[PDB]
């Protein structure tokens, strides 16, 4: 399927809630990777998923300091699931136009 369609299939709320808990100071982290596992391919279409996690939470990001902290968590999320981090995630541009 197209990258936009694969992301729409899975429920990214555990991923968004896991990142937001760390930013703002049952197992969301396991469920996030469990929901990210229900994809045709993780090495690919992962950047669109990572961007969509930030897109669904932009209204709760107040300034660029919060956005920068959110980006750091997103780029570390693949390592949290024992995945491979993609090498072309353009989160900076997408985080400034949401």
């Amino acid at each position: 399927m197209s990258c936009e369609r694969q992301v729409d299939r899975v429920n990214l709320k555990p991923c968004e809630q896991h990142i937001m808990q760390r930013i703002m100071g049952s197992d969301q982290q396991q469920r996030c990777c469990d929901e990210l596992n229900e994809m045709e391919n993780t090495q690919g279409c992962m950047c669109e998923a990572l961007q969509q996690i930030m897109e669904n939470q932009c209204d709760r990001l107040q300034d660029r300091q919060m956005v920068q902290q959110f980006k750091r968590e997103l780029m570390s999320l693949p390592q949290q699931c024992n995945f491979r981090a993609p090498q072309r995630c353009d989160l900076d541009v997408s985080g400034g136009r949401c």
Partner: antibody, heavy 122, light 108 residues
Framework: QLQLQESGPGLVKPSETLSLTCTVS??????????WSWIRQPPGKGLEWIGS???????YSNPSLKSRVTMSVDTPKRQFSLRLSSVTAADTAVYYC??????????????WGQGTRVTVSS | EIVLTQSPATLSLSPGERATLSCRAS??????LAWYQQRPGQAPRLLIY???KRATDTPARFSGSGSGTDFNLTIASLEPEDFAVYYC?????????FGGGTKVEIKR
């Protein structure tokens, strides 16, 4: 290749507050999925987790000690601190500072400090 | 929240014998359980994390196993450097708790 070094007084009077500081030697405080934590171990006893703190202030502490536990993080200074109020003789322990890693495949303290012995006494 | 009941102090075991360590979690700890090694006067050293996943700088004689509620730590070929107190640690839920500790002794 990071290293954790705890500092603070070794003697605390019974009515006062114990304060400890650990210094990170890697500028990894800002790094995601690392919870800077404290662990204590009384002589003749086992380990007891007392709390963990994120670089954003997101913190968790032992339920039996939360009321008296205060933690802070100073990212530019590569330091995090623990304040323990209303100490008792039960608070006499060797206090460790450790780095808790929060992965789905790793939830543990990968690196510990040397440990500061703190005894409460008048 | 989650209690970690460990096996008692393992008796003295001669080198080359089999030592097993038991840790039990009253609520299921899932995959998140770790084993620590602590020689006297030393900070605890991470030994095993997750399930059967040994840490770096950990000898092959160390292995872990267990489902959510029952866990086992086994030292296949006991060595005199293995004298230490071993603690099981979990982070299934945010309240973190440690095991009581199993001190092993070496019969020589």
């Amino acid at each position: 290749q990071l290293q954790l070094q705890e500092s603070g007084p070794g003697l605390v009077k019974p009515s006062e507050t114990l304060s400890l500081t650990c210094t990170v030697s890697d500028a990894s405080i800002d790094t995601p999925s690392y919870f800077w934590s404290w662990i204590r171990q009384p002589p003749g006893k086992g380990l007891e987790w007392i709390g963990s703190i994120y670089y954003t202030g997101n913190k968790y502490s032992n339920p039996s000690l939360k009321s008296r536990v205060t933690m802070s993080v100073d990212t530019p200074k590569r330091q995090f601190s623990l304040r323990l109020s209303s100490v008792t003789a039960a608070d006499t322990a060797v206090y460790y500072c450790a780095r808790y890693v929060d992965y789905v495949w790793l939830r543990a303290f990968d690196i510990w400090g040397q440990g500061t012995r703190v005894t409460v006494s008048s | 929240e989650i209690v970690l009941t460990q096996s008692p102090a393992t008796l003295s075991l001669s080198p080359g014998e089999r030592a097993t360590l038991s840790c039990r979690a009253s609520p299921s700890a899932g995959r998140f359980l770790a084993w620590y090694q602590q020689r006297p006067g030393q900070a605890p050293r991470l030994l095993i994390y997750d399930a059967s996943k040994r840490a770096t700088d950990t000898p092959a004689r160390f292995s872990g196993s267990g489902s959510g509620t029952d866990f086992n730590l086994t030292i296949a070929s006991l060595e005199p450097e293995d004298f230490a107190v071993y603690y099981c640690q979990h982070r299934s839920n945010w309240p973190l708790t440690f095991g009581g500790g199993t001190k092993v002794e070496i019969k020589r």
